[PDB]
């Protein structure tokens, strides 16, 4: 769940990759199913939306039993897991996943060639902003990171809802394409980490579950301020929490070699400089030709 | 009467002192108040003219001893008050200038004050070059502490070659160095103790 | 001027810490300096440092003890006064007499903070108990100081066994008020 | 009288504290500062020699930290002395010129301090003459007048209050009091009062009454 | 001292005076040039002139009438309740002027009142200076009393507050 | 038994809590005691962190638990301040989910809730009782009863012969505390379409009085209780904490802003950024916003310092938009339509208090605009009598309506 100990239970079940993938909350029927689940579990709706700290302590104590009793029915039996929790005296607890999410949020949204340099240097500064937060004397940075993580998750959820509702994910025998060209949150999708967050969100929902074949997904986002696409080549994933022989074998990501070959053949000023080869930057006028070349490559 | 301009100048000096006290190093002296000083000096010249007239009248004319004494004493007292006010203003400005010189635009300084600043910097260089050469007099009065600290650069710069070594001050790059080596760089504002 | 404004006619807490660290303390060395290079400090004795054996208690300056603890090469010996039992005894002594001050060491506030920060696992008593007892002692001392400030005059004042930090706290106010009263009295004569 | 380096450092600390808390400019301990500067120079040379050549890392670190601490103490003492000279500039000149008083700047300051005093006095006199004094009549151009409405020479405050700790001898002035304890006796002339200072205690006394004791080192300012 | 802004300003206040001589040419002192000053005439003069005129004369040139800030009303107000009295309105340099007055006239009755007032006000001054703030999440009386502080009291309060704040910051620094 | 245990728990919480190195609440209590401020502000987050059972008990039955918290605070204060004081007051800060004002219902009776709204009216300080001395009419038996504001007291009916209600209060040996009544209106945004704003009465005591004025957005933490006025009860709120949306750093920022060499031009630009042209009107409105320095003469003739402006042009000129922006920008402003209101709306009108039936004076727009700016629109449609009333009001800035049973006057510096 997403920031269970720093938000409301309803929000924890709402802004979650696995929960949404299992229940497909992006449509109204998913929200109705979630409401029915909460009603069956016995937790009221007003109580479920109260912050974790101020929520009634009885339900907080009995939560594990409630989850065990009433989650098999809705298929969310893989939600339960064992994780590390670190708490300092008289201060609220925090789990490893929440700490990592806060650190990533601080890295992402915390705070011609000139714009590129400014963006990269802002990311470098955010690196140090995150570095300090990793200490026990800088709890304020941790709280700010948690708030920023909440905001980023809300924005990514909204964008994913829009994409899924409008059915922008075209399907091809080899790969799947999702190109963004408008929206209110397109500014955020310039940091590779945020774009990868959106990619993971989309991969979990209907690309790894819902009886769908596993194909690499190419996700791109425009930025009119520089006229280029932050194309990212993501790898598929097997259903979460399903141990099997095929699950043991890692799913290799073949985007790097095909990307390099296509860049070598053509000339579109592709910026292959990120350490992760999955991400490049292609000019606006040369996106569709590059996609056609990738389709013809047959190397994915 | 005669001390109004002096009192106004003293009020301005008080305001300057309060401003200097409020901040630490951003303090910049206000524009050297020249008009009021010139008015006060015109007042002093007028008082000198009156004194000369009184002397002439006493030597040539009718002027009883008591009246002459009263007038002379009053004039002398006004001149003394003006002298005190101007001297206090100048002394305060000199104190601020000395503070600035020891710690380390000029349009706010009278040419005499600019010469004063130059000479005082020369003097500071003079004392430090004598027998007190082992101790850097123009140092930091914060007592020593943990020998090794982490300093983060706050301003992009080149491979500045200081006496202690070559530090590539790439913006947003942390160092782990002895506090002594990066004391002056911290003072100049390139680094941050965090 | 040559000296800042706040450093005139008084001290700063950093300088008080500097003064406090110039005192000796006992430590448990973890290495064997004694022979079967070597220290030649000039301000402090260097014989003790050159002759130290592991686990055998020795005396060195507090500043050097902290430097050794930074590398984890010694274990500081908490003074006898810091222990809990002594703190309860001193609290009872303070409570019994509402006029006189206890007889704690002059450096009982700086040393407490330095040891609580740098050496948090060398004590033989719980840390929170020590912090609470020190807070109670400080509060009672503050009450007594407040009560005693009503007897300022133009002749003199006596504050037996008052720590250096509290004297530094009160130096400006007491000195200035007494100076003004003395000036008024002198003018009266 | 040389005893040991640690004794010299203790004397340096005592002088620094006295100067910081004192209301007047105390005499300069020439020999102590000469010895300390020579020792600092020789120790720095020895440190350089040792560093020219991981068990020895910590000894050298302690060397450097100790040198930094000693340098800080000396620098603070010198700066305090310079500021005190700055404030009481005209008074020092009057004292030096005055033949009756046995005090002499050569017996109260070092060579660097006397150079600073002379140069600062000259510069300030030039500035005031250029700005203000040259326009005044012959009766009001003296920068040091002692017959006007307000004295132009600011003298040290002879009754400033200071915190004193009665250390005692390292003495006819010592008379054991009624409560089984040795104690000094002082007299306040303005109030016609007699005060008794018992060893191992902290007082808030006037400077003039205890100045002789401070000179003799019986008591030390906090 | 000579170079002290607060000392210079205090001497600039206006004290009542009564000329008991008949001097000509001193017209500008009263309100107009070129008019002889009659005798037994009251006028307001700055202290730096009134003091010298009173001291220097057999018969002083001026006779300082009882000021308005040392009247029986102010003495009774000071004796009644020192803390709530607003000294700032009475005079921004009350203590310096008071000390100068006692020195000039060596009156042993005002000294006791001034000393008691200063002590009582200093009690509350220290009470307010030692009360700092805490940012637990991460003054009205203080402001009300702070506005009633003389210049000397304001300086003492600022110094004491700075000392207390520095000590607290050092003590609770992480 | 249980009460003593709860008191000890609260005492231990206060005396033991510490985040990094500083005892927050101990030092806060000491500082508050030093300046004669008898109160303690506690963040509920810290209380939950220290021990969840204490917060559980506090939230369960606040009316019963809070007084014990005050007793513990008073005991700790006496321990900390007096070497071996009135009952202190507890102020609470919380970050729980806000409950809309319109959604309050019987489910939240006698529970701590957090809401928000806009204050529309405030009363004058009352005098509640905290320690009453009582003497019997017949046998003259002296007794004392202590009272706490929270309800889940009345004079004894049986003497401790003497008939019913035999006790009378000795007012020369009793103690009282301040009380105030406020009215809270739901935020305009949350009002559903076609419905009307609902109001809620609130009560505050001791150091929470005189903390707000009408027209200020506030956030309230308090107890939703009911007081008897078929078998219905009137809801109301007992305030425990006020946090209204209303130093040196801002002084430095403002001083730096004033140092800009084109301050006049930027200020004239900020005046109505959305309206083109009319630069002279923009500068005049800036001058009106800043105003003129006050003048007072010892004789009695004090000149006016405020500035008034007249905009007289044909329709479609954005005069109303300028007036709206002036109203919004100024810290204190009243936007009034001349025809919409009347003589009562502006200046002042003499009315009668219904509850007490006494003639009183109620101020108009100008009175409510004292110390600010009043933007009157459609000067033409306003009636001539109201125009002459405004003439007098601006002439003297003191609406002189002192007759008809009363002789009170009000200031209208606007
Ligand atoms: N320069 C301008 N920029 C923008 N709007 C303007 C401008 N000049 C006039 N307006 C118009 O002003 C309108 C709002 O002001 P309005 O016309 O009601 O003022 P008014 O002339 O006092 O009205 P009326 O005279 O009809 O009572 C807007 O609809 C608008 O577009
Ligand atoms: Mg209109
Ligand atoms: Zn009865």
Query: What is the SS3 assignment for chain D?
Result: CCCCHHHHHHHHHHHHHHHHHCCCCCCCCHHHHHHHHHHHHHHHHHHHHHHHCCCCHHHHHHHHHHHHHHHHHHHHHHHHHHHHHHHCCHHHHHHHHCCCCCCCHHHHCCHHHHHHHHHHHHHHHHHHHHHCHHHCCCCCCCCCCCCCCCCCCCCCCCCCEEEEEECCCCCCCEEECCCCCEEEEEEECCCCEEEEEECCCEEEEEHHHHHHHHHHCCEEEC
Residue E32 phi/psi, 5-degree rounding, is: -150, 145
F320, F379, F382: which to mutate for ligand 1, most atoms within 8 A of CB?
F320
Q: At a CB cut-off of 8 Å and minimum separation 6, what does F86 contact?
A: F38, F74, F175
Task: Pick the residue whose CA is nearest to atom 15 on ligand 1.
Answer: F318
Residue with tokens 């030692």: E130
The residues that bridge with F119 in the sheet, in sequence order, are: F184
Answer whether F238's CB lies under 8 Å from F222's CB: yes
Residue with tokens 């007042």: B43
- Cα separations in angstroms, D186 against A153, D189, D194: 78, 10, 6
- Side-chain half-sphere exposure of F103, counting CA atoms within 13 A: 12
Same-domain pairing of B146 and B136: no
Instruction: State in Å, rounded, how far the first CA of chain D is from the last one.
Output: 25
Answer whether F31's CB lies under 8 Å from E133's CB: yes
- Cα separations in angstroms, D108 against A97, D29, E153, F226: 70, 9, 36, 83
In the 8-state DSSP scheme, what is residue A176?
Answer: E
Q: At a CB cut-off of 8 Å and minimum separation 6, what does C50 contact?
A: C33, C34, C38, C39
Token output for A119: 């963006």
Checking DSSP bridges between strand C74-76 and strand C58-61, what pairing results, if any? Answer: unpaired
In the 8-state DSSP scheme, what is residue A4?
Answer: G
Q: In chain C, which residues are followed by a C-to-N distance beyond 2.5 Å, i.e. a gap?
A: 36
F317, F327, F375, F381: which to mutate for ligand 1, most atoms within 8 A of CB?
F317
Q: Is B165 left (phi over 0), alpha (psi -120 to 50) or beta?
A: left
Token output for F276: 């083109």
Q: Which of F252, C7, F259 minimizes the C-alpha distance to B23? A: F252
Same-domain pairing of B134 and B147: no
Atom of ligand 1 lying closest to residue F278 CA: 1
Q: Which of D51, D43, D31 minimizes the C-alpha distance to D70? A: D43
How far is the C-alpha of A16 from the C-alpha of B2, rounded, in Å?
81
Instruction: State in Å, rounded, how far the first CA of chain F is from the last one.
Output: 62
Render C151-169 in DSSP notation, one character per residue: G--SS-EE--S--HHHHHH
Same-domain pairing of B68 and B157: no
How far is the C-alpha of E45 from the C-alpha of E13, rounded, in Å?
8
- Side-chain half-sphere exposure of F278, counting CA atoms within 13 A: 20
Same-domain pairing of B15 and B88: yes
Instruction: State which residues form the domain around B66.
Output: 1-140
Q: Which of F63, F65, F83 minimizes the C-alpha distance to F73? A: F65
- A104-143 b/e (C-beta count within 10 Å ≥ 16 → b): bbbbbbbeeeeeeeeeeeebeebeebbbebeeeeebebbe
Residues of B in contact with E49 (CB under 8 A): 74, 77-78, 81
Query: Hey, are the CB atoms on B144 and D72 less than 8 Å from each other?
Result: yes
Same-domain pairing of B6 and B29: yes
Q: What is the CB < 6 Å shell around ligand 1?
A: F 275-277, 315-321
Q: Binding site annotation covers F316? A: yes
Token output for B122: 């020369």
User: What is the number of residues in chain A?
Assistant: 300
Same-domain pairing of B82 and B42: yes
Residue D149 contacts E where some CB pair is shorter than 8 Å: yes
Q: Which of F103, F93, F88 minimizes the C-alpha distance to F33? A: F88
Q: Binding site annotation covers F315? A: yes
How far is the C-alpha of E99 from the C-alpha of C187, rounded, in Å?
7
Closest Cβ–Cβ partner in D58, D65, D86 for C2: D86
Residue B172 contacts A where some CB pair is shorter than 8 Å: yes
Torsion of CA F110, F111, F116, F119, to 10 degrees: 20
Interhelix angle for E108-129 vs E72-80, to 10°?
Answer: 40
Helix count and strand count (H, E) for chain B: 5, 5
Token output for B56: 């002439």
Residue with tokens 């020479």: D153
Q: Looking at chain C, which residue has its C-alpha nearest residue E99?
A: C184
Q: Looking at chain F, which residue has its C-alpha nearest residue E144?
A: F35
F330 exposure class (CB count in 10 Å sphere: 0-12, 13-18, 19+): middle
- Cα separations in angstroms, E7 against A242, A294, B74, D13: 86, 86, 21, 36
Same-domain pairing of B130 and B153: no
- Cα separations in angstroms, C150 against A277, D168, E126: 77, 30, 11
**CA F194–ligand 2 middle distance (angstroms):** 26
Query: Hey, are the CB atoms on F19 and A137 less than 8 Å from each other?
Result: no
Residue with tokens 């409301």: A8
Resolution (A): 3.5
Answer whether B85's CB lies under 8 Å from B37's CB: no
Q: Report the gap between the CA of C143 and the closest CA in chain F (Å).
A: 7
Token output for A255: 């985007």
Q: Which of A250, E130, D103 minimizes the C-alpha distance to C170? A: E130
Neighbours of F199 (CB within 10 A): 14
Q: At a CB cut-off of 8 Å and minimum separation 6, what does E53 contact?
A: B73, E17, E45, E60, E61, E62
Residues of C in contact with F81 (CB under 8 A): 143
Query: Hey, are the CB atoms on B87 and E5 less than 8 Å from each other?
Result: no
How far is the C-alpha of F301 from the C-alpha of A179, rounded, in Å?
76
Q: Locate the domains of chain C by residue range.
A: 3-189
Same-domain pairing of B40 and B74: yes
How far is the C-alpha of D101 from the C-alpha of A116, rounded, in Å?
76
Number of domains in chain B: 2
CA angle D167–D168–D174, rounded 5-degree value: 145
Greatest alpha-carbon span in chain B:
87
Architecture (CATH level 2) of domain D3-154: Up-down Bundle (1.20)
How far is the C-alpha of F95 from the C-alpha of F103, rounded, in Å?
19
Same-domain pairing of B136 and B147: no
- Cα separations in angstroms, E169 against A9, B22, D159, E37: 40, 19, 32, 62
DSSP H or E run through A220 = strand A217-221
Q: Locate the domains of chain A by residue range.
A: 6-76, 95-300
How far is the C-alpha of D197 from the C-alpha of D219, rounded, in Å?
10
Using DSSP's 3-state secondary structure scheme, residue E100 falls into: helix
- The distance from CA F34 to its chain's CA centroid, rounded to whole angstroms, is 26
- C22-42 b/e (C-beta count within 10 Å ≥ 16 → b): beebebebeeebeeeeebbbb
Neighbours of A218 (CB within 10 A): 24
- Cα separations in angstroms, A77 against A12, A72, A74, A81, A241: 16, 5, 8, 10, 9
Residue with tokens 């070559």: B166
Render C52-88 in DSSP notation, one character per residue: --TTS-EEEEHHHHHHHHHHT-EEE---TTTSHHHHH
How far is the C-alpha of F306 from the C-alpha of B158, rounded, in Å?
58
Taking the CA atoms of chain F, what radius of gyration do you get in angstroms?
28
Residue F78 phi/psi, 5-degree rounding, is: -65, -40
In the 8-state DSSP scheme, what is residue E37?
Answer: B
How far is the C-alpha of D109 from the C-alpha of D117, rounded, in Å?
9
User: How would you write B85-149 as a 3-class SS string?
Assistant: HHHHHHHHHHHHHHHHHHHCCHHHCCHHHHHHHHHHHHHHHHHHCCCCCCCCCCCCCCCCCCCEE
User: How would you write chain F as a 3-class SS string?
Assistant: CHHHHHHHHHHHHHHHCCCCCCCHHHHHHHHHHHCCCCEEEEEHHHHHHHCHHHHHHHHHCHHHHHHHHHHHHHHHHHHHHCCCCCCCEEEEECCCCCCCHHHCCHHHCCCEEEEEEEEEEECCCEEEEEEEEEEECCCCCEEEEECCCCCCCCCCCCCCCCCCCCEEEEEEEEEEEEEEEEEEECCCCCCCCCCCCCEEEEEEEHHHCCCCCCCCEEEEEEEEEEECCCCCCEEEEEEEEEEECCCCHHHHHHHHHHCCCCHHHHHHHHCCCCCCCCHHHHHHHHHHHHCCCCCCCCCCCCCCCCCCCCCCCCCCCCHHHHHHHHHHHCCCEEEEECCCCCCCCCCEEEEEECCCCEEEEEECHHHHCCCCEEEEECCCCCCHHHHHHHHHHHHHCCCCCCCCCCCCCCCCCC
How far is the C-alpha of B141 from the C-alpha of A70, rounded, in Å?
68
Token output for E107: 């009156």
In the 8-state DSSP scheme, what is residue C103?
Answer: -
Query: Hey, are the CB atoms on B73 and E56 less than 8 Å from each other?
Result: yes
F178 exposure class (CB count in 10 Å sphere: 0-12, 13-18, 19+): middle
Token output for A6: 């720093």
Torsion of CA E99, E104, E106, E112, to 10 degrees: -20
Interhelix angle for B65-103 vs E47-55, to 10°?
Answer: 140
The residue among F46, F60, F94, F97 with the most chain A CBs within 10 A of its CB, best to mutate, is: F97
How far is the C-alpha of F306 from the C-alpha of F286, rounded, in Å?
13
- Cα separations in angstroms, C1 against A188, B94, D116, E127, E156: 52, 9, 14, 32, 21
**CA F172–ligand 3 middle distance (angstroms):** 20
Nearest ligand to residue F162 Cα? 3
Render A64-104 in DSSP notation, one character per residue: HHHHHHTSTTTT-TTS-----EE--TTS--EEHHHHHHHHH
Q: At a CB cut-off of 8 Å and minimum separation 6, what does C186 contact?
A: D159, D190
Q: Report the gap between the CA of F280 and the closest CA in chain A (Å).
A: 39
Residue with tokens 């150079």: D115
In the 8-state DSSP scheme, what is residue E66?
Answer: P
User: What is the number of residues in chain E?
Assistant: 174
Residues of F in contact with E127 (CB under 8 A): 34-35
Checking DSSP bridges between strand F39-43 and strand F89-93, what pairing results, if any? Answer: parallel
Residue B180 contacts D where some CB pair is shorter than 8 Å: yes
Token output for E122: 């200093």
Closest Cβ–Cβ partner in C128, C135, C140 for F26: C135
Query: Hey, are the CB atoms on F18 and A137 less than 8 Å from each other?
Result: no
Neighbours of A32 (CB within 10 A): 12
**CA F325–ligand 2 middle distance (angstroms):** 13
How far is the C-alpha of F127 from the C-alpha of F67, rounded, in Å?
19
Q: Binding site annotation covers F238? A: no
Specify the experimental method: cryo-EM
Taking the CA atoms of chain B, what radius of gyration do you get in angstroms?
26
Task: Pick the residue whose CA is nearest to atom 25 on ligand 1.
Answer: F315
- Cα separations in angstroms, F163 against F98, F139, F142, F143, F290: 51, 11, 16, 17, 69
């Amino acid at each position: 769940l997403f920031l269970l100990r720093h938000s409301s239970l309803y929000d924890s079940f709402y802004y979650s990759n696995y929960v949404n993938a299992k229940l497909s909350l992006w449509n109204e029927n998913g929200k109705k199913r979630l409401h029915k689940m909460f009603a069956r579990m016995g937790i009221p709706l007003s109580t479920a939306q109260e912050t974790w700290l101020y929520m009634d302590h009885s339900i907080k104590r009995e939560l594990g039993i409630i989850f065990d009793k009433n989650l098999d029915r809705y298929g969310l039996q893989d939600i339960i897991r064992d994780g590390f929790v670190r708490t300092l005296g008289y201060r609220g607890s925090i789990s490893a996943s929440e700490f990592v999410e806060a650190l990533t949020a601080l890295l992402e949204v915390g705070n011609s060639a000139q714009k590129l340099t400014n963006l990269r240097k802002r990311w470098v500064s955010n690196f140090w902003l995150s570095w300090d937060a990793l200490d026990d004397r800088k709890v304020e940075l941790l709280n700010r990171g948690i708030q920023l993580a909440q905001d980023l998750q809300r924005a990514i959820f909204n964008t994913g809802v829009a994409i899924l509702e409008k059915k922008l994910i075209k399907h091809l025998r080899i790969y799947r394409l999702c190109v963004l060209q408008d929206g209110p949150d397109l500014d955020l999708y310039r940091n590779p980490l945020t774009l990868l967050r959106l990619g993971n969100w989309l991969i979990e929902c209907c690309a790894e579950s819902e009886d769908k074949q596993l194909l690499p997904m190419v996700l791109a986002s425009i930025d009119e301020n520089t006229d280029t696409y932050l194309v990212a080549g993501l790898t598929p994933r097997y259903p979460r929490g399903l141990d099997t022989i095929h699950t043991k074998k890692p799913i290799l990501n073949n985007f790097s070699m095909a990307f390099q070959q296509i860049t070598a053949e053509t000339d579109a000023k592709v910026r292959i400089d990120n350490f992760e080869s999955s991400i490049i930057e292609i000019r606006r006028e040369d996106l569709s030709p590059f996609l056609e070349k990738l389709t013809l490559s047959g190397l994915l | 009467m005669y001390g109004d301009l002096g009192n106004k100048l003293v009020l301005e000096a008080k305001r300057t002192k309060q401003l200097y006290a409020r901040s630490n190093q951003d303090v910049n002296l206000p524009m050297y108040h020249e008009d009021i000083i010139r008015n006060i000096l015109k007042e002093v010249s007028n008082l000198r003219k009156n004194t000369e007239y009184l002397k002439e009248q006493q030597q040539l004319g009718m002027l009883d001893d008591k009246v002459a004494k009263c007038q002379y004493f009053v004039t002398l007292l006004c001149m003394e008050r003006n002298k005190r006010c101007l001297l206090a203003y100048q002394r305060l400005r000199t104190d601020i200038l000395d503070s600035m010189a020891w710690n380390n635009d000029t349009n706010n300084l009278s040419h005499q004050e600019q010469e004063y600043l130059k000479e005082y910097c020369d003097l500071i260089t003079d004392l430090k070059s004598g027998d007190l050469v082992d101790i850097d007099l123009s140092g930091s009065l914060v007592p020593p502490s943990d020998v090794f600290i982490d300093v983060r650069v706050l301003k992009d710069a080149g491979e500045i070659q200081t006496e202690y070594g070559v530090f590539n001050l790439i913006k947003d790059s942390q160092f782990f160095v002895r506090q002594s080596d990066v004391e002056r760089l911290i003072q100049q504002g390139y680094l941050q103790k965090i | 001027m040559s000296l800042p404004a706040h450093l005139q006619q008084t001290f700063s807490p950093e300088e008080i810490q500097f003064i406090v660290e110039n005192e000796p303390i006992k430590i448990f060395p973890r290495i064997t300096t004694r022979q079967k290079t070597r220290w030649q400090l000039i301000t402090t004795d260097d014989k003790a440092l050159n002759n130290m054996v592991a686990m055998r208690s020795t005396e060195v300056v507090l500043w050097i003890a902290l430097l050794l603890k930074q590398q984890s090469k010694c274990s500081i010996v908490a003074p006898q006064w810091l222990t809990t039992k002594e703190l309860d005894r001193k609290i009872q002594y303070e409570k019994t007499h509402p006029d006189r001050f206890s007889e704690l060491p002059w450096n009982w506030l700086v040393l407490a903070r330095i040891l609580f920060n740098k050496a948090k696992d060398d004590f033989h008593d719980p840390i929170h108990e020590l912090r609470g007892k020190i807070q109670d002692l400080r509060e009672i001392r503050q009450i007594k100081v407040l009560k005693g400030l009503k007897y300022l005059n133009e002749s003199h004042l006596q504050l037996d066994n008052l720590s250096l930090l509290e004297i530094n706290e009160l130096r400006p106010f007491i000195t200035e008020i007494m100076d003004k009263l003395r000036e008024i009295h002198t003018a009266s004569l | 009288i040389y005893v040991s380096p640690q004794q010299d450092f203790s004397d340096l600390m005592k002088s620094w504290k006295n100067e910081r808390c004192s209301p007047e400019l105390l005499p300069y301990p020439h020999q102590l500062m000469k010895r300390l500067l020579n020792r600092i120079s020789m120790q720095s040379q020895l440190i350089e020699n040792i560093s020219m050549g991981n068990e020895s890392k910590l000894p050298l670190l302690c060397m450097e930290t100790e040198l930094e601490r000693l340098k800080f103490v000396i620098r603070s003492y010198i700066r305090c002395r310079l500021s005190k000279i700055d404030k009481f500039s005209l008074y020092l000149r009057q004292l030096n010129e005055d033949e009756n008083s046995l005090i002499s700047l050569t017996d109260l300051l070092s060579k660097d301090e006397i150079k600073y005093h002379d140069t600062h006095s000259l510069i300030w006199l030039k500035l005031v003459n250029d700005s203000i004094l040259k326009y005044m009549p012959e009766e009001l151009q003296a920068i040091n007048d002692t017959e006007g409405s307000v004295n132009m020479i600011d003298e040290p405050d002879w009754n400033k209050f200071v915190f004193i700790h009665v250390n005692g001898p390292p003495d006819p002035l010592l008379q054991e009091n009624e409560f089984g304890k040795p104690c000094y006796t002082v007299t306040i002339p303005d109030l016609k009062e007699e005060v008794e200072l018992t060893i191992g205690s902290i007082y808030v006394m006037r400077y003039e009454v205890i100045r002789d004791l401070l000179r003799d080192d019986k008591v030390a300012l906090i | 001292g000579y170079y002290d802004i607060d000392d210079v300003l205090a001497d600039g206040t206006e004290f009542p005076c009564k000329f008991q001589y008949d001097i000509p040419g001193l017209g500008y002192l009263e309100n107009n040039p070129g008019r002889p000053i009659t005798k037994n005439t009251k006028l307001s003069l700055p202290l730096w002139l009134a003091r010298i005129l009173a001291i220097v004369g057999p018969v002083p040139f001026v006779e300082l009438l009882p000021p308005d800030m040392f009247s029986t009303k102010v003495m009774n107000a000071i004796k009644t309740d020192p803390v709530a009295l607003d000294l700032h309105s009475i005079n921004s340099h009350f203590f310096s002027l008071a000390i100068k007055w006692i020195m000039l006239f060596s009156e042993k009755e005002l000294a006791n009142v001034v000393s008691e007032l200063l002590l009582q006000r200093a009690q509350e001054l220290n009470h307010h200076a030692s009360s700092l703030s805490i940012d637990l999440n991460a003054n009205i009386a203080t402001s009300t009393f702070l506005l009633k502080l003389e210049e000397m009291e304001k300086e003492i309060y600022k110094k004491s507050h700075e000392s207390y704040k520095d000590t607290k910051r050092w003590m609770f620094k992480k | 038994d249980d009460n003593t245990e709860i008191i000890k728990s609260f005492k231990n919480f206060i005396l033991e809590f510490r985040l990094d190195s500083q005892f927050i609440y101990r030092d806060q209590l000491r500082n508050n005691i030093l300046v004669k401020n008898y109160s303690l502000t506690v963040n509920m987050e810290h209380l939950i962190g220290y021990n969840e059972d204490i917060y559980k008990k506090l939230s369960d039955e606040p009316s019963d638990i809070i007084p014990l918290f005050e007793t513990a605070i008073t005991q700790v204060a006496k321990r900390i301040s007096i070497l071996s004081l009135p009952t202190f007051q507890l102020i609470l800060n919380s970050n729980a989910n806000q409950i809309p004002l319109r959604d309050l219902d019987s489910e939240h009776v006698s529970k701590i809730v957090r809401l928000s709204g806009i204050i529309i009216s405030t009363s004058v300080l009352s005098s509640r009782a905290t320690y009453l001395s009582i003497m019997c009419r017949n046998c003259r038996h002296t007794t004392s009863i202590t009272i706490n504001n929270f309800n889940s007291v009345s004079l004894p009916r049986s003497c401790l012969n003497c008939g019913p209600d035999p006790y009378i209060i000795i007012h020369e040996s009793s103690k009282f505390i301040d009380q105030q009544f406020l009215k809270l209106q739901e935020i305009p945004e949350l009002v559903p379409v076609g419905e009307m704003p609902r109001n809620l009465t609130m009560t505050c005591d001791r150091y929470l009085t005189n903390k707000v004025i009408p027209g200020t957005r506030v956030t309230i933490v308090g107890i939703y209780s009911i007081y008897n006025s078929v078998a219905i009860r009137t809801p109301y709120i007992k305030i425990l904490g006020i946090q209204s949306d209303v130093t040196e750093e801002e002084e430095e920022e403002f001083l730096q802003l004033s140092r800009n060499p084109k301050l006049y031009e930027i200020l004239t630009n900020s005046i109505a950024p959305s309206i083109f042209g009319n630069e002279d009107i923009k500068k005049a409105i800036v001058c009106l916003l800043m105003g003129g320095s006050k003048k007072i003469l010892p004789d009695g003739m004090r000149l006016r310092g405020d500035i008034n402006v007249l905009l007289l042009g044909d329709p479609g000129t954005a005069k109303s938009q300028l007036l709206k922006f002036v109203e919004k920008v100024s810290p204190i402003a009243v936007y009034t339509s001349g025809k919409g209101s009347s003589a009562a709306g502006l200046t002042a009108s003499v009315q009668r208090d219904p509850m007490t039936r006494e003639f009183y004076l109620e101020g108009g727009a100008m009175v409510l605009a004292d110390g600010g700016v009043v933007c009157i629109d459609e000067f033409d449609k306003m009636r001539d009598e109201d125009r002459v009333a405004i003439h007098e009001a601006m002439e003297q800035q003191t609406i002189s309506i002192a007759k008809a049973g009363i002789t009170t006057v009000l200031n209208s510096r606007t």
